[PDB]
Design a protein around this ligand. Structure first.
Ligand SMILES: *[C@@H]1O[C@H](CO)[C@@H](O[C@@H]2O[C@H](CO)[C@@H](O[C@@H]3O[C@H](CO[C@H]4O[C@H](CO[C@H]5O[C@H](CO)[C@@H](O)[C@H](O)[C@@H]5O)[C@@H](O)[C@H](O[C@H]5O[C@H](CO)[C@@H](O)[C@H](O)[C@@H]5O)[C@@H]4O)[C@@H](O)[C@H](O)[C@@H]3O)[C@H](O)[C@H]2NC(C)=O)[C@H](O)[C@H]1NC(C)=O
Ligand SMILES: *[C@@H]1O[C@H](CO)[C@@H](O[C@@H]2O[C@H](CO)[C@@H](O[C@@H]3O[C@H](CO)[C@@H](O)[C@H](O[C@H]4O[C@H](CO)[C@@H](O)[C@H](O)[C@@H]4O)[C@@H]3O)[C@H](O)[C@H]2NC(C)=O)[C@H](O)[C@H]1NC(C)=O
Ligand SMILES: *[C@@H]1O[C@H](CO)[C@@H](O[C@@H]2O[C@H](CO)[C@@H](O)[C@H](O)[C@H]2NC(C)=O)[C@H](O)[C@H]1NC(C)=O
Ligand SMILES: [Cl-]
Ligand SMILES: [Cl-]
Length: 310
């Protein structure tokens, strides 16, 4: 089959059908089945039917970023067993992706879902993608991080989740990520992290948690991070008292580079780095919940265990 209109087809280095920066409001008909690389970025494609791309059995790279995508059929990528790169980024209209869209893509190693406005990550959305190494989910509308979302992503090295409305980190949210190298979770709403949440992140070297809503960090949370060399806890409402003691001992016994850990409370130790603080500064308590040692024994029950010291 000859090359379709408003397109350029060539064979070197791979059989490529290139139709970018056109006025195409949909996928052009007549794309050669021999295509290994398809470039349809910079257009105005609204929908991606299931019939399209099926002919291209040998398709390895597919670019559909910077379009007007709003609805992708669940069987659109059926038959593309050799698909390696899939870029669907910069599609703010694409608010939701059907959980069975990526089934069968066992060769996919890079996936772009950034700047799409994804509200949620559907159950089984990343099931069976055991070859995925780069997953871009940054700058979406994600406001939840469900357990076992990346359970099958054992080869994943880069996971970008920054720029979302993610409120907390459940225990099994990052389970299965044994080969994770960099984890970017900055500019979210993270205020709570489970003690055994980084259970499998032993090979993690980079962890970005800055610009969040964290007030404290448990004792067992940073324990499994044996390979961590870069850590950033900038821009967080840290509370510097007895509850910050397990974090302080960790920051002290840490060789890798880490950003500043600015205190927010109490005002006495405000703006100072928890790193440089001494063991004496980490006693008593600071104001939490209702603003105010005139608290009753019942009232201090709503305070940390160390904070309840007599
Ligand atoms: C990152 O992703 C990796 C994949 O991208 C993943 O690697 C996968 O690991 C899993 C382990 O859970 C493997 O699953 C296993 O698959 C094998 C398949 O058989 C394998 O070994 C046979 C050996 O055959 C022998 O006998 C034949 C005679 O028939 C001889 O010729 C041969 O020389 C041997 O003596 C081999 O033939 C298989 O080859 C496959 O691929 C060729 C194409 O190259 C096909 O033509 C062939 O038919 C066959 O399908 C294959 O190597 C299975 O038997 C086990 O039970 C188990 O299910 C995956 O295969 C493996 N995928 C790879 C390597 O691509 C990594 O695990 C992942 N990383 C992390 C951390 O999760
Ligand atoms: C995806 O990739 C696979 C694997 O690379 C590929 O299967 C292969 O297709 C090519 C070409 O279609 C095959 O090579 C040809 O073999 C046929 C017979 O098998 C020959 O007829 C060809 O020789 C000439 O004849 C043609 C006209 O009769 C000429 O037009 C042509 O230019 C040649 O001069 C040619 O050598 C190859 O045998 C298979 N199999 C393998 C294992 O490579 C498949 O086609 C690709 N595309 C899709 C959609 O699957
Ligand atoms: C950061 O987290 C705090 C909770 O620690 C959020 O504020 C709380 O809001 C609830 C009501 O939903 C109150 O009961 C709490 O007393 C509030 N706590 C504090 C410390 O204000 C706050 O909204 C979060 N901020 C962001 C930007 O997500
Ligand atoms: Cl990449
Ligand atoms: Cl506590």
């Amino acid at each position: 089959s000859p090359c379709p209109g408003a397109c350029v087809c060539y064979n070197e280095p791979k059989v490529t059908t290139s139709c970018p920066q056109q006025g195409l409001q949909a996928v052009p008909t007549g794309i050669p089945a021999s295509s290994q690389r398809i470039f349809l970025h910079g257009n105005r494609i609204s929908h991606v039917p299931a019939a399209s791309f099926q002919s291209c059995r040998n398709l390895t790279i597919l670019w559909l970023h910077s379009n007007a995508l709003a609805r992708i059929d669940a069987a659109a990528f059926t038959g593309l067993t050799l698909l390696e790169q899939l870029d669907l980024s910069d599609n703010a209209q694409l608010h939701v992706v059907d959980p069975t869209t990526f089934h069968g893509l066992g060769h996919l190693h890079t996936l772009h879902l950034d700047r799409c406005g994804l509200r949620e990550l559907g159950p089984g959305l990343f099931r069976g993608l055991a070859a995925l190494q780069y997953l871009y989910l940054q700058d979406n509308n994600l406001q939840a991080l469900p357990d076992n979302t990346f359970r099958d992503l054992g080869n994943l090295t880069h996971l970008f989740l920054h720029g979302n409305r993610i409120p907390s980190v459940p225990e099994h949210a990052f389970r299965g990520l044994h080969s994770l190298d960099r984890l970017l979770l900055h500019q979210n709403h993270v205020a709570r992290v489970h003690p055994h949440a980084f259970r499998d992140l032993g090979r993690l070297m980079t962890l970005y948690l800055f610009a969040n809503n964290l007030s404290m960090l448990p004792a067992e949370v940073l324990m499994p991070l044996r390979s961590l060399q870069y850590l950033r806890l900038n821009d967080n409402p840290w509370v510097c008292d007895c509850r910050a003691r397990p974090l302080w001992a960790w920051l002290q016994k840490f060789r890798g580079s880490s950003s500043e850990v600015p205190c927010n409370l109490p005002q006495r130790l405000a703006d100072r780095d928890l790193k440089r603080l001494a063991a004496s500064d980490l006693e008593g308590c600071a104001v939490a919940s209702g603003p105010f040692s005139q608290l009753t024994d019942e009232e201090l029950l709503s305070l940390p265990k160390c904070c309840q010291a007599a």
